[PDB]
Amino acid sequence: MGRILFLTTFMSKGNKVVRYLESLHHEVVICQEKVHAQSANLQEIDWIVSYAYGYILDKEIVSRFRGRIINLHPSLLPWNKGRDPVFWSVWDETPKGVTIHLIDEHVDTGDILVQEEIAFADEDTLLDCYNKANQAIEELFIREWENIVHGRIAPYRQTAGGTLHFKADRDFYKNLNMTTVRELLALKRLCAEPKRGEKPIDKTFHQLFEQQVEMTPDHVAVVDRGQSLTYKQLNERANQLAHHLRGKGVKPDDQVAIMLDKSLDMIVSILAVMKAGGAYVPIDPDYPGERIAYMLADSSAAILLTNALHEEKANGACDIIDVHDPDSYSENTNNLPHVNRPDDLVYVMYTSLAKGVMIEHHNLVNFCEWYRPYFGVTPADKALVYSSFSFDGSALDIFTHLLAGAALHIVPSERKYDLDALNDYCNQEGITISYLPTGAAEQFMQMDNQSFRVVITGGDVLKKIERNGTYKLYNGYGPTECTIMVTMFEVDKPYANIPIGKPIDRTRILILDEALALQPIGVAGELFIVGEGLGRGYLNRPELTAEKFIVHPQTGERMYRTGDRARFLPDGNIEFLGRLDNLVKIRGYRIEPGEIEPFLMNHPLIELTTVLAKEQADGRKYLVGYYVAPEEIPHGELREWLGNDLPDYMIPTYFVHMKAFPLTANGKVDRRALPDVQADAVAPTDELEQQLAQVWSHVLGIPQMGIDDHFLERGGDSIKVMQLIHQLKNIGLSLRYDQLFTHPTIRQLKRLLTEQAAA
């Protein structure tokens, strides 16, 4: 009848389309590369049919063949023009369908021959969508082809609007497409960009404070022992001092060092530094003289607010303002003229090699403003200033409760470590809410308390949730870099791994793979913080800042690299599991012991596990799983147990039973005191996985296939997982595409295949 050029780079040469056309006695030339006018394929060609063709036709060709170039595009064509139409159809939540259409000079903007709505299920995977759509448009082709050849169809222009995507746009999401529609959209709801309508934070802290002074001026602000300052009193005093400070040349972004013990003077000083226009640098006087000299040196601070007591610890490093000298205090009690922007520094705190972290006003403001309503903080509340001067926990303590008009209580040294006496003080003063570091918290749970409405903990891994009090318990999480905590969770029931929860106002958290691409929900990956909490970075360490605070390759958003491992739960709450990915690997494999410990722990008989890597004295390391238990558990059983969730190379080669773990006084178990193991010290075991080793080797092109070896750390991909299953189905037993992403190693796949057809 007539000669047909079939243009495709993705679809096979055995398509239903091609075969139907041949069934009609058409000679079908198949071309998967870009052609020019001179090309031999273009000789004697009546109709050109393009299906998932990766190239653009030269305008010459499109004009000479005008009216006769048909394209099959799996989407409501106005929608999802360009690359990956089905994927973007699911992600952007556009209308669904398939369109057969004329080709014009632009990308899928030609007039529509025949169009048909399609529907996807919540439980279908993205691959399912892809295939169903291809199927539907092929069937559509077959139905309407005759009415296309006889030109008896009216092509109508496309509806205005629609969307266009390019080749690179799907990069960020390259891992998602074995994911389900439901799961994908959930990942969208969690991780996608913030909704329109928002505006930058326009306030500085001392603004919100002074406002809160005017609203509640007579109410107590901060209490130390018996003595108190009302919000008006505190504000006035801090204003006097601040007038003196700004009078000494303190400007926006200027560092001002404060070295004092927990007191009213400390609050006075912090607020004074703020009001005078600077950022404050907290120095604990109980630090070694060395770290003190260093904090003073690294800091550009020219002024030091301090006691006559701790004066000399400075060694004359800077100008000293004594908080006990009346001359340090101006007569003026009025608010100073505002010189500040929310992007000015509010404080610099050091972490420990010790880095000075620069936090801005809008960071703090975001945190306070999320804190007050979330915990329902009213002036009825009373809070503890517990955490050290130089930790961000102090920032939470002071600032979150000042702006809600609450009452700060200073903790004295004696009460601080005696949690029994501090409990007593809390019950006598009726302290409603506070933040205790993990382990301090756990201890307070022992003390019978009826003073707290809410306690908040984080900074170390919470494990004990049992408590004598009637109060709600919260586990939060967040680096000093992103201004205190970027997540919070309400602990309702016990957990083996207590989740860290959901993000706060104006902060998103992204679970990423090593390549900085999104992970599907439930799949572990590094935790990246995006949003309002991200600070300015480390002081005088611009390269280190450049390493930690990154500009996303695909996205271009400023994000923080925590170095923490974490994953999303189905209910959205974030779960913490380890750090970097280091300490040591094993046998050529990147391994985290932390990743293994929980899978070990849910074994009904063991209550505590830690796993370590030890040296064979050959220079490299092997894996030892340490477990506390009633009695020794047989190695085979543990190997199988871990084997159900983990890849074999993660399964430790050793498993020590102990009746009890040795403990350091501070922290839980000591590693140095822990026993050590030793050994002088793989191909497919059975012939089933040895026969699928062949199909792996043939899909991806590897010489040798191991039992532990992954499918995806070799560069397996959507196409190759498919090629795997498609090829295996007709030379062997079929598999499901989910099974391969859940059980991606060789022997895991084997465990399936063996327990699959046999049951």
PDB file of C-alpha atoms in Angstrom, residues 365-460:
ATOM      1  CA  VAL A 365      12.117  34.674  65.146  1.00  0.00           C
ATOM      2  CA  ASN A 366      10.875  31.749  63.099  1.00  0.00           C
ATOM      3  CA  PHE A 367      11.696  29.396  65.923  1.00  0.00           C
ATOM      4  CA  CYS A 368      10.030  31.458  68.668  1.00  0.00           C
ATOM      5  CA  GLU A 369       6.974  32.041  66.520  1.00  0.00           C
ATOM      6  CA  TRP A 370       6.582  28.310  65.855  1.00  0.00           C
ATOM      7  CA  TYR A 371       7.313  27.485  69.486  1.00  0.00           C
ATOM      8  CA  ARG A 372       4.679  29.655  71.189  1.00  0.00           C
ATOM      9  CA  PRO A 373       1.531  28.315  69.471  1.00  0.00           C
ATOM     10  CA  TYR A 374       2.696  24.684  69.030  1.00  0.00           C
ATOM     11  CA  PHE A 375       3.129  24.335  72.783  1.00  0.00           C
ATOM     12  CA  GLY A 376       0.316  26.772  73.600  1.00  0.00           C
ATOM     13  CA  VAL A 377       2.504  29.087  75.663  1.00  0.00           C
ATOM     14  CA  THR A 378       0.596  31.711  77.657  1.00  0.00           C
ATOM     15  CA  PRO A 379       1.842  34.114  80.371  1.00  0.00           C
ATOM     16  CA  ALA A 380       0.546  31.506  82.873  1.00  0.00           C
ATOM     17  CA  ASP A 381       3.620  29.443  82.076  1.00  0.00           C
ATOM     18  CA  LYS A 382       6.892  29.288  83.951  1.00  0.00           C
ATOM     19  CA  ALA A 383      10.065  27.945  82.384  1.00  0.00           C
ATOM     20  CA  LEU A 384      13.553  26.879  83.425  1.00  0.00           C
ATOM     21  CA  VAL A 385      16.735  28.381  82.075  1.00  0.00           C
ATOM     22  CA  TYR A 386      18.539  25.053  82.252  1.00  0.00           C
ATOM     23  CA  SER A 387      20.999  24.471  79.415  1.00  0.00           C
ATOM     24  CA  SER A 388      24.459  26.034  79.389  1.00  0.00           C
ATOM     25  CA  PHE A 389      24.980  29.659  78.348  1.00  0.00           C
ATOM     26  CA  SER A 390      26.942  28.554  75.278  1.00  0.00           C
ATOM     27  CA  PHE A 391      24.390  26.045  73.941  1.00  0.00           C
ATOM     28  CA  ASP A 392      21.350  26.803  71.762  1.00  0.00           C
ATOM     29  CA  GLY A 393      19.170  25.075  74.351  1.00  0.00           C
ATOM     30  CA  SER A 394      19.644  28.297  76.284  1.00  0.00           C
ATOM     31  CA  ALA A 395      18.285  30.192  73.274  1.00  0.00           C
ATOM     32  CA  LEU A 396      15.168  28.030  73.361  1.00  0.00           C
ATOM     33  CA  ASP A 397      14.863  28.422  77.140  1.00  0.00           C
ATOM     34  CA  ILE A 398      15.106  32.207  77.232  1.00  0.00           C
ATOM     35  CA  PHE A 399      13.723  33.499  73.966  1.00  0.00           C
ATOM     36  CA  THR A 400      10.814  31.165  73.288  1.00  0.00           C
ATOM     37  CA  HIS A 401       9.328  31.896  76.698  1.00  0.00           C
ATOM     38  CA  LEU A 402      10.006  35.628  76.743  1.00  0.00           C
ATOM     39  CA  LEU A 403       7.947  36.271  73.584  1.00  0.00           C
ATOM     40  CA  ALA A 404       4.991  34.314  74.960  1.00  0.00           C
ATOM     41  CA  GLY A 405       5.081  36.478  78.075  1.00  0.00           C
ATOM     42  CA  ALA A 406       6.049  33.551  80.304  1.00  0.00           C
ATOM     43  CA  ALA A 407       8.246  33.532  83.425  1.00  0.00           C
ATOM     44  CA  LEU A 408      11.870  32.436  83.200  1.00  0.00           C
ATOM     45  CA  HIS A 409      13.427  30.753  86.214  1.00  0.00           C
ATOM     46  CA  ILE A 410      17.207  30.678  86.600  1.00  0.00           C
ATOM     47  CA  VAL A 411      18.646  27.348  87.677  1.00  0.00           C
ATOM     48  CA  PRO A 412      21.468  27.586  90.242  1.00  0.00           C
ATOM     49  CA  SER A 413      24.405  25.149  90.218  1.00  0.00           C
ATOM     50  CA  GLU A 414      23.256  23.174  93.266  1.00  0.00           C
ATOM     51  CA  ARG A 415      19.834  22.445  91.774  1.00  0.00           C
ATOM     52  CA  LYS A 416      21.204  21.699  88.302  1.00  0.00           C
ATOM     53  CA  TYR A 417      22.662  18.195  88.784  1.00  0.00           C
ATOM     54  CA  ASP A 418      20.507  17.208  91.745  1.00  0.00           C
ATOM     55  CA  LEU A 419      17.422  16.463  89.650  1.00  0.00           C
ATOM     56  CA  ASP A 420      15.562  15.505  92.852  1.00  0.00           C
ATOM     57  CA  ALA A 421      16.002  18.972  94.338  1.00  0.00           C
ATOM     58  CA  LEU A 422      15.384  20.588  90.952  1.00  0.00           C
ATOM     59  CA  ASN A 423      12.201  18.505  90.810  1.00  0.00           C
ATOM     60  CA  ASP A 424      11.258  19.874  94.224  1.00  0.00           C
ATOM     61  CA  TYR A 425      11.910  23.438  93.053  1.00  0.00           C
ATOM     62  CA  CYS A 426       9.753  22.779  89.990  1.00  0.00           C
ATOM     63  CA  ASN A 427       6.863  21.536  92.140  1.00  0.00           C
ATOM     64  CA  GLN A 428       7.139  24.447  94.589  1.00  0.00           C
ATOM     65  CA  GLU A 429       7.304  27.107  91.877  1.00  0.00           C
ATOM     66  CA  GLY A 430       4.922  25.134  89.660  1.00  0.00           C
ATOM     67  CA  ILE A 431       7.095  25.132  86.543  1.00  0.00           C
ATOM     68  CA  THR A 432       4.937  24.318  83.532  1.00  0.00           C
ATOM     69  CA  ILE A 433       7.390  23.794  80.666  1.00  0.00           C
ATOM     70  CA  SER A 434      11.122  23.437  79.930  1.00  0.00           C
ATOM     71  CA  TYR A 435      13.807  21.871  77.736  1.00  0.00           C
ATOM     72  CA  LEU A 436      16.113  19.252  79.236  1.00  0.00           C
ATOM     73  CA  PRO A 437      18.876  17.576  77.198  1.00  0.00           C
ATOM     74  CA  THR A 438      18.394  13.799  76.716  1.00  0.00           C
ATOM     75  CA  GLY A 439      19.422  11.739  79.759  1.00  0.00           C
ATOM     76  CA  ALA A 440      18.817  14.685  82.021  1.00  0.00           C
ATOM     77  CA  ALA A 441      15.247  14.266  80.784  1.00  0.00           C
ATOM     78  CA  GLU A 442      15.306  10.464  81.227  1.00  0.00           C
ATOM     79  CA  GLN A 443      16.441  10.991  84.803  1.00  0.00           C
ATOM     80  CA  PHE A 444      13.701  13.536  85.509  1.00  0.00           C
ATOM     81  CA  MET A 445      11.167  10.935  84.391  1.00  0.00           C
ATOM     82  CA  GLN A 446      12.238   8.945  87.476  1.00  0.00           C
ATOM     83  CA  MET A 447      11.537  11.867  89.826  1.00  0.00           C
ATOM     84  CA  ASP A 448       7.815  12.058  90.543  1.00  0.00           C
ATOM     85  CA  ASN A 449       6.821  15.391  89.048  1.00  0.00           C
ATOM     86  CA  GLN A 450       3.432  17.086  88.933  1.00  0.00           C
ATOM     87  CA  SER A 451       4.732  20.501  88.014  1.00  0.00           C
ATOM     88  CA  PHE A 452       5.188  20.139  84.271  1.00  0.00           C
ATOM     89  CA  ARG A 453       2.569  20.403  81.567  1.00  0.00           C
ATOM     90  CA  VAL A 454       5.200  19.812  78.882  1.00  0.00           C
ATOM     91  CA  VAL A 455       8.838  18.689  78.768  1.00  0.00           C
ATOM     92  CA  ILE A 456      11.002  18.820  75.649  1.00  0.00           C
ATOM     93  CA  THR A 457      14.095  16.730  74.915  1.00  0.00           C
ATOM     94  CA  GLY A 458      16.596  16.168  72.099  1.00  0.00           C
ATOM     95  CA  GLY A 459      20.291  16.344  71.202  1.00  0.00           C
ATOM     96  CA  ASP A 460      20.950  12.711  72.029  1.00  0.00           C
TER      97      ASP A 460
END
